[PDB]
Structure 1
């Protein structure tokens, strides 16, 4: 007799948006660590 229905007060909220995180080492910093490695290696 009971009918499956949304719970009282409604369900909670869902995410409908991409949550892709723009996380990265900044480019200059990235290149500097690399060039520094080659300089040490060459020496």
Structure 2
């Protein structure tokens, strides 16, 4: 006879359980990364803002020099 049957040793394994691998970093790591990014941004902003203030002072004194003729 010929029918639809499983083999002698059966079929392979079949999963039925929830699989969540829990990928990622701990909270301390991401918080430290954020704090370091904030500090780097603050330092770069302080340097560029001081330079921009000096440039603005230079332009203002240029206007001071040009004022009496106008």
Q: TM-score, normalised by structure 1?
A: 0.84
Q: Deviation above 4 Å: which 4+ runs of structure 1? A: none
Structure 1's unaligned 5+ residue stretches are: none
Q: Pairwise CA RMSD of aligned residues?
A: 1.0
Aligned residue pair count? 42
Larger Rg: 2
Gaps of 5+ in 2: 43-70
Which structure's residues are more often helix, by fraction?
A: 2
TM-score (norm 2): 0.55
